[PDB]
Amino acid sequence: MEKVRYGIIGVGNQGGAYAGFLTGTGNVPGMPAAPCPPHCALGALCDIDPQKEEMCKEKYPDVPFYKDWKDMVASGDVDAVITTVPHYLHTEIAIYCLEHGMNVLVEKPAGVYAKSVREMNECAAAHPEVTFGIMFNQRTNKLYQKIREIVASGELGEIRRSNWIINNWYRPDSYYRLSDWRATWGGEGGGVLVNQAPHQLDLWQWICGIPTTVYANCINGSHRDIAVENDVTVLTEYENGATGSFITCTHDLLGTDRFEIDLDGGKIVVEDSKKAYIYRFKETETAVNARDDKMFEVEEFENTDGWGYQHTTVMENFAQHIIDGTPLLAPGSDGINGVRLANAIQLSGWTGEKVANPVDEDKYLAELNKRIEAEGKFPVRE
């Protein structure tokens, strides 16, 4: 049980990268690549595009190739698959694999609409022997683990506020024109929220809990020739009375990336997703208020993860679950938290109203489908 063979569905940008990581062919001069994880190997490659097949024949000549991912699953050349394909296919593949005893590592975001993701979760719960995971690779980052640990420990008391401005992923019209599926309601089901935002959206929920209510201002085609949102401002509320805000866009040439958490007993500020300043109050504010600088102590944490580290670490973690039951950092059921939040943001955005989180699945789907229909590029979803 030394190694788990992985089949990549979609040898696109992400799929290609994964293939390189598994093969040890990942490194670019000027880019260290993480070595192949011990328990991981590349079993097979699947793509519907002939050009991709040609590339696969060239770069990976001795690696079995399949046009149809169902054929790859049945081949027994692979022990698990990774869904590096457009998001709409994620739950479709997952459900099929769970029903056919095939371990599935689903890419972010888990899916486009919460209904399909819920079905996937229920399917997995009904085939528990099958390993079911999501590629929330940022959970392998010691930075976010550090912040989660401190918050969850209750050492700094309860959260009162979170604020994350993350504007540093500039993407011009030229980038948007590169992919047909990306930035299309029918292709992606959204823009920034379904692409750049999901890892962060999961992280925010993972560290700060899941918002009870979502209010969002979503601008479609902000300084860009697309129909989907790429400038988003969100307000959230939480069971315990805390508030939150999240701001992101793809038109900022010099975007802030600053994540603040304010707590009863301290404060955390994370800059550029690398460095965290942790402030511990000598006394909780509640205590200070009751009474009627030397007052705080500051701790610093910095971590940067090298190319391939996060994805390989997930791959290895996932393999290990299959092999010896090691717990998953990213159990696939968790994928729905991020999808629900993205859906709630979009629906708030579309209706101009605050919404409870999660939103009604059918209401979201209708509004998505309406947009898909108008776009006319892709089939509506049932």
Next chain:
Amino acid sequence: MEKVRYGIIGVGNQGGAYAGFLTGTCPPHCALGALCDIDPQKEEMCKEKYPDVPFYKDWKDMVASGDVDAVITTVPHYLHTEIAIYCLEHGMNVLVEKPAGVYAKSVREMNECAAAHPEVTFGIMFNQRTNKLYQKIREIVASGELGEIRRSNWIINNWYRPDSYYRLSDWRATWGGEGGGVLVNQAPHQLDLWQWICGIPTTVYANCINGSHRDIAVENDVTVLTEYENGATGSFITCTHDLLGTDRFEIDLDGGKIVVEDSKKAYIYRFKETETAVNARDMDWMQIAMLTSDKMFEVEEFENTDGWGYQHTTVMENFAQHIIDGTPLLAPGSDGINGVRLANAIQLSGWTGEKVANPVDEDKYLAELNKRIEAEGKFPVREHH
């Protein structure tokens, strides 16, 4: 006239400060004409500290006395428009304190009154407009040098105020006394500044928590989203329960970025090329990769701190100068309504849980305020029309 005598209505903390500045216990064109307070203790203090300065219980008597050439409304906010309107109708120059008023209806009436008596000088104490820091940022934005604004965000949590502070004043933090908490107290100078530099929001969405970690009925934790005619967005966050509050004001523009830290220091980033230009170039991913990794932007730094009394005296002097020789006002009183409307819109959004257009319906706001006043039971309900 060489000097304008000022009558202070409300020798409270602000009134006292002003009195000191003018006594030198002064700006060249400014003097203290008279003091007015309804509290006997204040009168006694005024007799002690300012024995040669005429004192009046009734501010209407002070106005008519001809001991003063202008008045300053250092009294609870509900009186601001009442005094202003009276003074405009009686040819008396009036410098209205922040916020201009509690509810927009009364402030609008004040503005219309002033517009009907234009010979009377009408001003507001937006003393932060005298701060070279905010002047610098306004100038750059308004010049169009950095192109249009796309986003503003101001987190300002550094005015920690515990329950003990709230207990100090009966009028403060009461719907009937103040008409709000953080929005009517700490927030107004900032709210004006935000509007002054970034324009006035078309729409306001707000999350306002009453009695956040505090034993008060009014809001003291506020998160706001705004939209603007030109498609920009904005956010404003403030509260009085943060022991170590951020104060960071960011403006993102087509052609640069501004970040102001702790209300003292500004970092100005000027893009070599505007984003619109970069987008038009349709640069390839390698070029995009080069962008994100300092060559693209240049940084300028600006820092100013204003010493005690500078801002208030400078306004006083500016105001006097308008009366004397027509010098333009840095803070024309009509502008006071921008901040009041925004505060009202924030509150009303907060109360209804819905986005609102700015400005909101005056009667709707007043009703919701009055409902809260009635429940509080500390003060009489306020009725206009």
